[PDB]
Each structure stands twice: as C-alpha cells, then as structure tokens.
Amino acid sequence: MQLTYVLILAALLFCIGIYGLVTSRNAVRVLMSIELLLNAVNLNLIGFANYLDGQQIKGQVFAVFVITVAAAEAAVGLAIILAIYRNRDTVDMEKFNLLKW
Amino acid sequence: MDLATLTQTITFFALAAAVIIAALGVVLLDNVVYSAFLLGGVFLSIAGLYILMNADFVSAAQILIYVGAVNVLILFAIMLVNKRETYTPVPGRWLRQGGAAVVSLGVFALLTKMILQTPWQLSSVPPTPDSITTIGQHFFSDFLLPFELASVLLLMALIGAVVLARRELV
Amino acid sequence: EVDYNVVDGVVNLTGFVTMVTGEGLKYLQNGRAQFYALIVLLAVLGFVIFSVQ
Amino acid sequence: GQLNAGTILPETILIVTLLVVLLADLIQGRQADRWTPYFAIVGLGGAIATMIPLWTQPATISFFGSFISDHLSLFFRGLIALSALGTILMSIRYVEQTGSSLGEFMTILLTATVGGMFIAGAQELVFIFVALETLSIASYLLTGYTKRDSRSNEAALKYLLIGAASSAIFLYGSSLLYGLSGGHTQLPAIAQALSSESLGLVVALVFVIAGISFKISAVPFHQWTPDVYEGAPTPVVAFLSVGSKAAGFALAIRFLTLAFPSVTDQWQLIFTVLAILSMILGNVVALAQTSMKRMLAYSSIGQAGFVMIGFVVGTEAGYASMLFYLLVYLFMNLGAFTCVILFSLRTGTDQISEYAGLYQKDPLLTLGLSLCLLSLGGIPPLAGFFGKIYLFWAGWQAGAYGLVLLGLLTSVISIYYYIRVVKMMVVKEPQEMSEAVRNYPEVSWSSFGLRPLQVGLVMTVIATSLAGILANPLFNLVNTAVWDVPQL
Amino acid sequence: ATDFNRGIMKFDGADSPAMIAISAVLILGFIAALIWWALHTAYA
Amino acid sequence: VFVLSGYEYFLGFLIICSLVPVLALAASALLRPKSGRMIRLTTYESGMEPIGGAWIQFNVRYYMFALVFVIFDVETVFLYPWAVAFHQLGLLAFIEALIFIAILVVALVYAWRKRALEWS
C-alpha cells in the first residue's frame, strides 16, 4: 500500500487548507490556503496517474492544467487584494463586513 | 526493502512530514512572511513528491510556477501590503476557530474513510519514464481544447489583473 | 369583533409569521466570506452524511 | 474519435471577436469605444447565426472525446450568447459613465461567454475545469471592475474566496472521479467504468454538486450571490444571474446525467433538498431587501429553486421545463436589469423606496420593469407564467407533489416583493413620490448608449410579454434539446 | 376596533380580549357544532 | 514503481549541496570572534542613525512585473512539451501552438501598451 498514503497526505493537505481558508484574518493567507487546496488536488491527480494510469498519464496533464489555472487565479486574487487594499488601507478579513444583510 | 525502496519510502515520509509541517506553518503562524516562505517550502516538498511518483516534468513545472512565479508574486504582494496592523482578537473567535477545526477534522475523517475503504484499481504495468513526450502528444489530442482555452484564460487574467491593480491618474 | 379580530388575526398572522422569517433569515447571510465557506463545507459534510443513510 | 473543428465556430467567432475588440482598444484607445460594442454585438449575433446550421446536424462529438455538439449544448450556447448580447447592450453607457474602459470590460465579458459556451458541451473533466474557471476568473474580474468602489472590491474579494474554495472542492471531486474510474476523464468513460454506488462516489458527487451549486446559487452555497449582486456592476450581475446560472445548469445536466447515471436517486435527493430550501430562503428573504439589486439576487436564488424543481424530476418534460424556464428567465431578468440600469443611470440610486412616483416621469421604464417583474412573479399573459406552468405540469407528472406545492406557495410569496416595486412605480402618488423622481432628468435616448439600452429594453419586454402565448415554437425548440439527455 | 364602537354599536367592553375570546369560542364553536352535526345528522 | 532514472544522484546532491552552506557557516561559527558586549545591532543608513521613517512606498510595479512573469511563465511551461514532442507532431500541432503563441503575443502587446512594463 502506497497510493493510499499519497491520498491521505493529499486529504490532510486539503483539510489544512480548509482550516485557514475559513480562519485566517489576513486576506493573503486565505489565498495561501487556496493554493494549499489546489496542491492537495494536484497530489491526488499525480498519485492517481502514477498508481492507476501509468501508461497514459492523463492525471499529469490534468495537474499541469490545474497548476497553470491556479497560477492565474492567484494572480487575479492578489490583484483583487491590492484593489481592496488601495481603498481601505487594511487587508483584514474582519474589516470587509460591509455587504451584510 | 534493500536500498532503493527503502530510500523511496524514507524520502516519501520525509517530504510528507515537510508538506504537513510547512503547511501548518503556512496556516498557524502569526508572521505572514513566514507563511509566504513556508508556502515555497510546501511547493518544493510537493515537487519532490512528484519526483517520487514518476512525474518529473510536472515536478519541474511545480518548481517553475509555484516556487518560481506564484510564491514570488505572493511575496511581492506581501511586501506591498506590509504594515503593522493591530489585529485585535474578536470575542466570537470560538465560533470561527472551533467550528473550522471540527469541519476540517470531519472532512479529514470522511476522506480517510473513503480512501482506506475504496478498492482502487492498482496497475501492475510500470509507468512511462518519458512523461513530457506523452504530455506533448496529449496537448494536441484529447487535451487540445483546454490547451487553447488556457491561452484565453491567461489573456483575460492578465487583462483583469492589469486593470484592477492600476492607478488611473488622468 | 370576532370577524375583525380572530379571523383577520389568523390572516394577518399568516402574513406576519412569513415576514419575521426573512427579517431573521437574512442574518444567516451576515457579510463574512469565511462564514460562507464554513457553511459551504458544513453543507458538503451534511450532504455526504445524509446521502449515506 | 476525430477532431471536428467546425463545431467550435460559435466560440471561434467569439474568440476572434474578443481579440478584435482588444486589439482595437489597444490601437485606438478609448475612442475605440464608439464602435466596438456594436462589433461585439455583431460577433455574438454571428455566433448565434452559426449555431443555426449546427442545429440540423447529428450529435457529432467534436474533439477527441472533449465536446458534444448536440441540441442541448447548442441551446445553452445560444442562451449564454444571448445573455452576453443583452449584457453588452446594457453596458455601453454604464461602463463609460464610471470612467472605466469599455474594451477591456467587453473582452473579460466575452471570455466569460466563451467559458460558459464551452461549459455547455464538455465531456473531459479537465475541459470542464478549464472552462469553469475561465468563467469563474472572468466573473471575479468583472465583479470588481469598478475598483474605485469599496463594495465592488469587497464583492470581488468575497466572490474569489467562495469561488476558489468551491473550485477546489469541485477539483477534489473531479480528481476522485478520475481515480475511481481507473484512469478515465471523459464522462461516458467514467459512467462505464463505475456503475454502483459506494462511499467515495457519493463523496465525489457531493463535492461536484457543491462546485456546481456555487454557480446555481443553491441555498447553502447562495451566500455569495446577494453580496456580489449588491457590489458588482449591474450588467455584470445581469450576466451572472442569466448566463452564469445557465452555464451552471448546463454543467449540471451535462455532468449528473453523464458522469453519474448510477447514483441518480442520491443526487436527486440532494437537489430536492437544494430546491426546497432554495425556494424557501430565496422567496422569503427578498421580502426584506430594500435594494433592487439585492432583491434581484434573492429572487434569482428563488428562480434557481424553481428551475431545480424541473431538474430534480428526471423525466423528459422536467428537463424541458427547466430549459424553457431558463429561456424565458433570460428575457425577464435582462429586462428587469435593463430597467435597474436605466433608473440608476438617471438617478444614481438603487433603493426600492426611491422608485416612488416614476409613472409620470418615465412611463417606458415603469412599463418595462412592471412587465418583467410581474413576469418573474408569474402573472398570466407574460412568459414566466407559462414557464412556471410547464415547471409544475412536469413535476406533477412524475409525482413530485410537495415540490410543486412549495413552488406555488413561494411564487405567491414572490408576488408580494415584486408587486412592491410595481406599487412604488405605478401606485404611489405624485405628492408621495421620492427625491430621485422629483429631480428626474429629461428622458433622452441620445447620450452615448441609451439607444442600445432602449433597444434591449424594448426587445426583452416584447419577448417576456408576447413569448408566453407564442411559446409553442419555443416548446418545440426546447423539447428537441432534451433527446440528447441520457435516460430522458 | 375603536371605529366599531361608535353610534348605535357602542358597548363598553366589547373590544376587550376576554369578551372577544368568549364570543369567538361561542360563535366558532357553534360553527363547528353545526358542521359536525350536518356531517352526522344529514345523510348525503 | 519508481522508473525515473538519474534521480538517485539528485537526492544525494541536493543533500550535499544543502550541507555545503551549512558546513561553511558552521566552520565559520567555530573559528570566529565571539565578542561584542555592546551594540553589534545597528542598521547601516549610510553612516548614521535611521533617517526618515522605517518604511518604503507602496508601488504596484512589483506586482505588475511578477504578474506578467506568471502569465508568460505559464506560457513557456505549456510550450515545453510542444517543443520536445515536435518531431512526432505535424503541421496541425504547429498551427495549434501558433494559435496559443499568438493569443499570448496579444497578451504581451496588452502588457506593453498599458503601462505595466515600466520603471523600477
């Protein structure tokens, strides 16, 4: 058994990203947690492409696309963080409670 | 476990402990620059993990993008928003943190149950060492439409991130 | 007095107890994004738990 | 399979239109904004016009197992293209009035359109992900486009947070589907490689359902929608309520009928709970909203519950009722958002109380917003009555009595908060009119983009009123897009 | 309630909640008694 | 099964190349003045006290250069498997990669024309 260890490590990385997506006060640490989530998914994909689909490695192509889309999504997320930092001069997530009920 | 599979298991457990420890340091650290450097530590240990499971081009892509470009961008934006904010702890911190911990532990217990419970269809054929040639054959095959759509995604992401991170002094 | 009070009380009470559940169900959407993702993940957990018995 | 690149000609025309609009605003600058909206309109019309020869073709799975050009994907591609066409007709004066550039806005909007139109037919798991995050990232960029406003920046940040979390949950579901089916990424190959319910398939199902219901705005995942529709530009939220929701429903029909035709009772129970509590919380929280955009957000959640009534039934008429309701919902919601645009351009306000007394100042705006909001409420001669009639006819057919009863009850609740806006515009006295309507400008359709606004308003109002009684060609166009759904 | 207590219909303690409650149970109880009696005494 | 060849030296050379700054700094710290009962801890500031507040200016050029680096870095990592698997692919893959390169050339023209490649 070695694929299940890669999957359990990817699940632990996903839950470490979850605790931190919904915990962190800094808005950039939320994007760091989002990158942790995406790298957990990529660990699942590369492990599945290794232990199940080693000849046609479609999970590695999937992980290349996830890496390349997650790069652009982190880029536009830091753009949105800088745009919200320009007006309100904090980055604290507890000061972005303006669009309530 | 003579010497090769022993080295592979020792490397896997060392890199897994490095991912776990550095990812906890990304979350559970007060200094945000330490999280922004331990994120690169996470990405490097994950690239070593990809090296272990026969994905060398994807590991080099992981070093080139996540360490080389995404972490550098994150560090640049961290230096851009670097201040000395107080971050006064709100009185309802239990409702966020304890709920977040029990949700993360519930998702981890559920995922561990379905991972250890599922009969995965393990292959006996060894994988191909020539990964980048089959990925290049895949990019102009089955995966051609995402390959062309990724260019439009990158163009739109560059357009929007130039627009939103700009000053329009006119 | 019975007609104006009791029967119109049932009618206006039907129209009233559907107004205070939305003046008190809007506080479920409270402006915090991390609470919203917590609700999303609790929904994921609850739908897995209820979809398997 | 074999590559069939003649399928992508709507999206190819729209990608070329995107590139021409961007290159024109790079060459000419802001003075390129005088003709490039009309070029984007002609490009979207050309995409819809090239969809017409594709409608008379077979199923013709296009790329190497990566795209389906059947009538269902063609219907959804035409729906998303019409949503973007109405959005471009609304965002000519509104984007120029904020001082922003119109060409970069239109290229991000056309990128969202090609992302939705690629969602509309998609078999690869990675093509589903790439098109879904093309639409998602373009929606985050369109949400905070007016970056001098704090509400748009906050809406973009909390939209990117929820969307990235839902994207990673969707990707964990897609990675689990890649692992559970051996090594397959196409949805029919996943359907063939797994055919029995197990712990792990239910996990991938609920993860994918969360990532999809983020786009649907079902009730535990609805919470981005009121903040985004209060914060973002109003044509962006018109596109997000029509075209993004249509892309999410295209993803749901493409995914749950192809990748999961084995746990159909499980995701039908899940979407039953989503529909029930989505109708409830969408139609009773809009009673207390005092802004028109937030009321339209909660009403959009209620309309998503009404569509999920027909989605959860699982028959041919149920999918047809969902398609017809999305088709008429395009007309009524684009007309309502066109009137919200045309009132906020002249008054600068959004509150429902500030609409008071509009009947004598701007009669066309009150006729438009009255007809579209009453069509959203389910008033007989308009289109939404017939859409709800089909949604309840298909839903009493396959024994879903409680969902049809809840849909009728929440439509009665919906009538109150729609008729409140109609009461503000029509019923309120001249001596009781608001400060925005007292200082109302002269009605002039000649400034920069108010004539495309009037053209889009007249077209959507004529559609949402006349196309309820002329619905039989729409019924015929919809019911042939249901034969391409498995198990019917 | 005060708009009904004028002129000919003018009685002290008519819109009181005790009087409204006893008149409500009297009226609506005779309604329910007549309905149950019609379902029982009348055939078809 | 680990089938990659050449990475049994990569781990050992990573270990030894990580130890060579560690051994250099440890051999420095062994033979060194352990000294300084007064202030080692001073900032430079060109010969005197810290002048003018301990801050730098927010400048978004640091974001814009790393952003265009992210975009064209992703472009190059997509272009690597096209490049090495070019001898096994015909004119059609060259046309498809030409479409990819042309869309990101339009992205470079946008990054040039809008003032995002600027001074630093």
Author numbering:
A (entry chain E): 1 to 101
B (entry chain G): 1 to 170
C (entry chain F): 603 to 655
D (entry chain B): 8 to 495
E (entry chain Q): 2 to 45
F (entry chain C): 13 to 132
The publication says:
In both cyanobacteria and plants, a type-I NAD(P)H dehydrogenase-like (NDH-1) complex is crucial for CEF and respiration. The NDH-1 complexes belong to the NAD(P)H:Quinone oxidoreductase family that includes the complex I (NADH dehydrogenase) of the respiratory chain in bacteria and mitochondria. To further advance our understanding of NDH functionality, we solved two single particle cryo-electron microscopy (cryo-EM) structures of NDH-1L from T. elongatus BP-1.
Interestingly, we found that the NDH-1L complex binds a PQ molecule at a pocket above the membrane plane. We assume that this is an endogenous PQ molecule, which was trapped in the cyanobacterial NDH-1L complex during purification, as was earlier reported for Escherichia coli complex I40. Thus, we named this structure as NDH-PQ. Similar to the two previously reported cyanobacterial NDH-1L structures, our NDH-PQ structure also contains 18 subunits, without any signs of association with NdhV. In addition, we found that the NdhS subunit in the NDH-PQ structure exhibits weak cryo-EM density, suggesting that NdhS is also loosely associated. In the NDH-PQ structure, we modeled a PQ molecule in a pocket (PQ chamber) at the interface of the membrane and hydrophilic arms. The smaller PQ chamber is caused by the different conformation adopted by the β1-2 loop of NdhH, which intrudes into the PQ chamber, and the side chain of M22 blocks the path between PQ and the N2 cluster. Indeed, the H23-D124 hydrogen bond is preserved in our NDH-PQ structure; however, the PQ molecule is more distantly located from the N2 cluster, without direct linking with NdhH-Y72 and NdhH-H23, implying that our structure represents a state of NDH/complex I that is not fully active. The occluded feature of the PQ chamber, together with the long distance between PQ and the N2 cluster, implies that our structure represents an idle state of the NDH complex, as was previously suggested for the Yl complex I39.
